[PDB]
Amino acid sequence: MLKAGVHFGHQTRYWNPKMKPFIFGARNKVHIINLEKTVPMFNEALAELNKIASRKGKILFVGTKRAASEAVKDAALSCDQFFVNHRWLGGMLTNWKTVRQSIKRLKDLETQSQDGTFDKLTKKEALMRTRELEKLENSLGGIKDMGGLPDALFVIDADHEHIAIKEANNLGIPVFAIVDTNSDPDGVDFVIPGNDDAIRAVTLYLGAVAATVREGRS
Template sequence: MANISMRQMLEAGVHFGHQTRYWNPKMAPFIFGQRNKIHIINLEKTLPLYSEAMNFIGSLAANRGTILFVATKRAAQEVTEQEAKRCGMPYVNHRWLGGMLTNFKTVRQSIKRLKELEAMGQDGSLERVSKKEGLMLQRELAKLNRSLAGIKDMAGLPDALFVIDVGYEKIAVSEAAKLGIPVVGVVDTNNRPEGVDYVIPGNDDAIRAIQLYAQGAADAVIEGRGSVAQMAGSPDEFVELSETGAVAAERPAKKVTKATVKSAPRRAPMKTEAAGETAGEVAKKRTAAKPSRPTAKPKTATTRTKPKTSSTK
């Protein structure tokens, strides 16, 4: 995924590090040597680490994960924005706002305000306010757009960070470490690899090298999403085997039409075994053959009167 050869890295200048007096001893395992007081990075170690990082980004994108591209230094701003937009991922290419990850609830309110101002500009509400208020709203819109334009469509915290120059973006790396968000970072010889989950030892100042990193990450995202779409588009096939174990010939699927659908047979009326008559006819004959019972006479209520006796004193 996003295969890059060592020759491409050499042509982009990935192997050039910083001056020897600015080096970080923790980067010693990735340094090949020095030339003209400049450290040379060992590309034999950079290439497999780069491939591992790109495979991680591709697998994360295949699982519909979000990778935040972070590169605020001047040499990487334009390239990062282009590649992040190409693969449909959020990005930060201007100043990193403190708490952009750890205080994302407040940042979300700022994003909501940015969308409100954009809606006001589209429906012409900014033109109906006073001139002074309109200028203030336009300045607020420009400020929010400069800082939050790349993450205004990000619904929540990202699943990973892709950082160019971890020393320059140390605040972003520290916030990601606090929240347990994995970091894929380009680490030069003057920075320390601590806090970076997937280290890419390489030059983080050359424009061609930065373009190589960003383009590779964007390609990994696109390939990861493409593999998922390809798997979803190809349904599983049912293979029928013969008695000998060989693959049987495919049978054409039968088309279901109205003519092939048969209605269920109606239930026949019950017949008696003796005369072959229906059950209803037999019941009528039985009721007609039964003698009618005499009707009982209605009982009349009788009242008894006590004889009156005359009492003599």
Template sequence: MSDVSMRQMLEAGVHFGHQTRYWNPKMAPYIFGERGKIHIINLEKTLPLFSDAMNYISSMVANGGTVLFVGTKRSAQTAVMENAIRCGMPFVNHRWLGGMLTNYKTVRQSIKRLKDLETMSGDGSFDRISKKEALMLTREREKLERSLGGIKDMRGIPDAMFIVDVGYEKIAIKEARKLGIPVIGVVDTNNSLEGIDYVIPGNDDAIRSIKLYVEAAADAANTGKLSVAHAVADSADEFVEVKEGGDAAPKKKAAPRKKAAKKVTVKKAAKKDKPEAVAAEADTATQDADAASE
């Protein structure tokens, strides 16, 4: 996981808040002061909170969890999509549909419809229907792709949610709180931090700032995946006992079960005794024949 420094935050403009007249008093502990009627965020408080949030994402993914990236405002759409794809996580970068999580059963039907249309488009089914019908189905697929394309491979409800602008994504936060999903959110000076489990005080409007947040979150997710891969590789390694001379000690064979050995012995003995019994019968028959001839 790449550690973000205070210098990087300064260069990205994370410390710039909103105009002082739009401030939210609940953000007062994270405000350093004001300059030119604009609040300045205290990065000395932002940096440790940011690190805690990234560590949480990493540990969540390492335990097999899924983090949903949410950023539907225009300045965040591209960064959210690119970095979520980079770390293999679901994302929503267009309008948040009401009930996307709380009514997930219905949303899954729309996702199934999207996948069916993608299959039809790929196997040439559109070529066997009229141009008008093909155009209508293509438009339907594009509309569903915009809304649900980022979550079509999501396996159920996510384990956490990373939000770029908590003021812009109020519906998503409400659904997450209703389902008990932890929320990691970037909170600017004009927003409230209520309902946010991991607060990141910072600029949520500048493209460079948003890119910094999302790239760090994607790196944290990849770090979590990498730790899982290392753990699996370590558990798969075989430990071989080595003698003092340097040669590997041969593996001990397991002793056969006693009952099975008895059965085998009895069978072999039976097979062995068979020809002897036949020979004895033949000798008896010969003696009887000699006695009769006398």
């Protein structure tokens, strides 16, 4: 078990009928995930994540909602993996050869800001490049050092980050998503039922994933 109490699914009216196997008898117009079926799938998801981390793969932590942005960022940094915690860019994966130029621009401004020419030039255009920086960094900071396509994708909300999932699907990248009762577990290669918005649940998922890939890097 090791996770009960923290997560309870969405209201019944928003339930995806493809979540019925993982639903355990909604209590009061609120669906209850079958944790007895959650424990094995989550373990096999963690097991597979460990295996690809053993193959020295890259795991992208995709959580974009405000309640989980910082949790995704810290967990990925703690396990020295990459992440996207703000708005997912359409084509982050499928249009990599274009977003690659954008992270290159971000890296150049990073050198310019800290050590390059950033105060030896006109001030209005100086902070123009400054304000461009955090915009380009809060969108691409978590994937500055990817150097390519990732080998795995861990998603907090399946339906919310549906764009990322289908970007991984057509690229052939396995997806590990926390699929709640209102999401379609179709594009997910390793479905993990559970809450996608509760702070305690998300940190618990991220801590387990962060630990598991760390042991995979050994």
